[PDB]
Amino acid sequence: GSSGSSGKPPTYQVLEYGEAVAQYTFKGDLEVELSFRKGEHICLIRKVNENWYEGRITGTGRQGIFPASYVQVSREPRLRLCDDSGPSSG
């Protein structure tokens, strides 16, 4: 809630989305190749694979995939890929 007007209710759902931190400054010109600055927080939408991670750079617009080794994975997303048998109790 930054501005006065607001449709969606004030809540924290992002928790679902993935979380990563740029460790190394990447560089790309092609669409698929998304650029980011170290420290920036890329919002993982649909993780492509354990190698390349898809996201977006809120504020600028850029969007695409990028090498993991470059970024830091802390909270992997969830698009209902597989169903593990009792992964964790909680």
Q: Could you give all domains of the chain from N- to C-terminal order, each with its CATH number?
A: 13-77 (2.30.30.40)
Please count the residues of the chain.
90
Cα 48 versus chain centre, distance = 11
Residues 6+ apart with CB under 8 A from 45: 17, 18, 54, 55, 56, 77
Residues 27/60, Cβ–Cβ less than 8 Å? no
Cα 89 versus chain centre, distance = 26
Task: Determine how many CB atoms are found less than 10 A away from the CB of residue 37.
Answer: 9
